Design a protein around this ligand. Sequence first.
Ligand SMILES: O=C(NO)c1ccc(C(=O)NO)o1
Ligand SMILES: O=C(NO)c1ccc(C(=O)NO)o1
Ligand code: NA
Ligand code: NA
Ligand code: NI
Ligand code: NI
Ligand code: NI
Ligand code: NI
Ligand code: NI
Ligand code: NI
Ligand code: NI
Ligand code: NI
Ligand code: NI
Ligand code: NI
Lengths: 173, 173, 173, 173, 173, 173
Amino acid sequence: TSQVRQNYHQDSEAAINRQINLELYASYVYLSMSYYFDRDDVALKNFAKYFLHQSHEEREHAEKLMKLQNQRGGRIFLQDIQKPDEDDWESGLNAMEAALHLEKNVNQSLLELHKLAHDKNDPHLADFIETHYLNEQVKAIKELGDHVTNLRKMGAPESGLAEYLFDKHTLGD
Amino acid sequence: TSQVRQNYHQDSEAAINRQINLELYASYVYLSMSYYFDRDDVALKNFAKYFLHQSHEEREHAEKLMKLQNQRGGRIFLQDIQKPDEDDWESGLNAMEAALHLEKNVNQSLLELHKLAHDKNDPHLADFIETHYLNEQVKAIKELGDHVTNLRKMGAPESGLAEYLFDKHTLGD
Amino acid sequence: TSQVRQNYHQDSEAAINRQINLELYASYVYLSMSYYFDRDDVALKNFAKYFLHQSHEEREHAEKLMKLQNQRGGRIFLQDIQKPDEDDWESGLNAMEAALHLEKNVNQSLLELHKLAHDKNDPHLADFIETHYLNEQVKAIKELGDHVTNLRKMGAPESGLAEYLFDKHTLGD
Amino acid sequence: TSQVRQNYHQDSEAAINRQINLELYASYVYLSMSYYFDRDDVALKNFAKYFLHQSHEEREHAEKLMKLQNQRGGRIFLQDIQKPDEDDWESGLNAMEAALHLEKNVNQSLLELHKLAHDKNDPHLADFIETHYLNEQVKAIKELGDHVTNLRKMGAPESGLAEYLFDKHTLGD
Amino acid sequence: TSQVRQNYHQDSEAAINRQINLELYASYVYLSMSYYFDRDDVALKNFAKYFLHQSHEEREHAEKLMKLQNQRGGRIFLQDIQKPDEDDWESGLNAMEAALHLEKNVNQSLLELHKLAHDKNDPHLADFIETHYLNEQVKAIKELGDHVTNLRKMGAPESGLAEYLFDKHTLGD
Amino acid sequence: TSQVRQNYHQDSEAAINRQINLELYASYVYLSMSYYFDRDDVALKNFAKYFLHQSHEEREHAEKLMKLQNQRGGRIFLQDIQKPDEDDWESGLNAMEAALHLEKNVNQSLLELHKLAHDKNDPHLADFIETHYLNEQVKAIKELGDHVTNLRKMGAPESGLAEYLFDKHTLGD
Ligand SMILES: O=C(NO)c1ccc(C(=O)NO)o1
Ligand SMILES: O=C(NO)c1ccc(C(=O)NO)o1
Ligand code: NA
Ligand code: NA
Ligand code: NI
Ligand code: NI
Ligand code: NI
Ligand code: NI
Ligand code: NI
Ligand code: NI
Ligand code: NI
Ligand code: NI
Ligand code: NI
Ligand code: NI
């Protein structure tokens, strides 16, 4: 047992490891989308920029959780990172909807983690999730919903004009 | 009777109180529209910016009238602020038309106030309305008419592409 | 149902709407006090400055809650804003005590909202209230209590000298 | 009863007084260690710098809690500050281990305080502890554990060379 | 015996330890007064500022004496810090008089220490007391006497107006 | 077939996908090492800094290869990222040797890729490997060998003093 461990339950430790793996997987998925939009037959540079930035943000999430694990006295256990469900994301609207679904899944995982933290009477971990993850997920979900709504009202994915003008006027700024 | 009151008729005082309430109500309506366009299923950030700024301008109108009341020797009497007629404003063109109607109503109220001020031989209040309210209402009505015309000629509200491009190229600047 | 709604209970949504209305009402009350102290027979400019700033802060509270509602997937429903209980606030000490009472009421409302949020297992809303509202209310209540104590120990409201010197040396800075 | 007290239970008030006394005692202990390393037969200036800074930080903790007490409507009751358990701290590694033990004790006290705050349904005090004390204690415990590990792997306390080089390369920066 | 000890008598060493404890106790008393004036039913922020600064100055006195002890070859022995005689200091004038009494007591202790230092033929310690403590105590006593005189001539503690205006015009600068 | 594909053989495309996966795996391994040295029972912050930077460099390698794939007309196919062989890297010298082995493996993979590129008469891909990967691998291998040699000559891993002083004087700059 580590000399710094105090009030850190092992169920919380396992949940932290699983959430690390999940954030890494989300980073992988965003990387996949980003370079999907870099293909010459898709060619939407601002979509690719957006999803690359999101991938780096998810990697930051993962590293934050690893530092948290080492901080409380837990021990990091890394698992394989699964391949994303798709290799062809069809369109920008489809990738936006997939991202919204992914963020909702990660958000439910974080919410159940917060429940487990409040149950094991771990206020430090509870507030860590409250402060560094929950509102960021809320903002990401609201933003992805805004993007999906805008792309839908413009005639996507039938109108490629819509996706071009959206790549220019919304993501290119 | 207040020691500063001079040539201030009580009909003018009641009209000032009513106009205060009306400007507050207009601010409330603009707030409603602003946060209607912030919803994830509408998602037009520049429409929301525009109507939030208009709400703050109407609140400035109200406070200006309150200071005018205290200046002439009148006495402020606040009333309830009515809820806006709608909670769902359908579209950006519809909200623009509603705003145009609201500003025309407020303008007629201010014009009848100026008539009552010239009747009671109150040149100070007459010029106060002339200087701080009339031309601002004229400019607001002309601008809302311009916006309605542009949105109409672009295919709104059927074309959501039109409202997106208008939010970007007209209100986002 | 909105595409972004997740773990947002409808009781929480109704509580958010009610708290929006309450913050708007508090803003209205502070506006009333502010322009009460602008009257020529009261004439305490720094009291008026103080209460006008407090009114703007309460309006900021309201808009923050509206953005929170749109963020979680709720739907804003605006109600009438009630007229303040009084039109003549008697004295600066009396207005300070009324403000203290109002802030205590708003604080109890926010506390019951936090209880409802922790009950419905909504940690995001719980931490939102924790972070953006609770400590601000605590600070406001402590400050209003300090002001009431100082005004009392100076001989208010009998001594108008006390209220003048307090307007100058405490609120005018 | 103070005019600002709201939802502040008296058990919480007593816990706040006890935690004030505990933070003051920790400051006293760190002061003792700091000036132990200033003796000519110990003579480790950076160890002394480190523990003096830690003493000042603990005094800041205490004053923060006193301001919190006055804020919620509680009443400060000061007790004697106990003399530290030791006057001779043997070595730098021994003082580091003593500091780690002390911080773990203070952390358990703060955790039980947070439990009592969530029990009495005091979300403001709960978030105050969450925000201003918990993560700081976690960081302090992790840092003291790092220092103890490094000193151990270097041959302390047998190797005085180890403590000298640690004072130079780790604490002197 | 320490390798640096020269002409340092053990009676002087015990006196230095006792004076360390006394300066720490004075710091504790000033802290008590400072946060007494922060209560909502007292609410004199500049009195609190003044006494907090005085507490920090007394802590500086204590640390200076500890460094002096380690310098001459003595050995620090810390004792408990006694709780201040009071928890409620009644008024600003009463706290000023208590501070004057406390500083006179500390001054007599320092004077007897200087006598013991000149007796044991310790000119270094004699000049240390002469240079770093005596005139500072004289200045503090004169300043506290000035404050007590001013508060008395203004009608304190009956006139709370007096204490308010004194907090503003004398301590708030 | 993509409209930009010219002289790009499909064996080269498969090799590019495999090398992408390998660079991602190397990034994962370096991340594992980095946060291994962040544990409280290891506690070598500069080792962790070094391996975190190396992980980010390997991720840059991977993204460079993905952009190259999209450039030539190939199609990215992502695979699972395998878990590193170890979770406990024993010591800094052991982690350095593991990193040297990993970089030698990646270098052999890149060399066989260059052979396949010169065989399929693809000078662009050959020079891409020549310019952006080969010399970087040579430098990394030489640097890791230097680090291993230095750690060995200092008495690692038996002497923890050696690893501490190496973390300070070589990696902390
Ligand atoms: O919020 C709680 N702990 O922090 C909690 C969950 C369930 C109960 C309970 O058992 N009520 O009867 O309490
Ligand atoms: O000032 C003195 N020493 O520095 C001193 C004190 C008493 C005497 C004495 O014994 N006079 O007869 O001298
Ligand atoms: Na005119
Ligand atoms: Na919190
Ligand atoms: Ni994430
Ligand atoms: Ni609970
Ligand atoms: Ni354009
Ligand atoms: Ni208007
Ligand atoms: Ni509020
Ligand atoms: Ni004055
Ligand atoms: Ni502390
Ligand atoms: Ni060195
Ligand atoms: Ni002193
Ligand atoms: Ni590489």
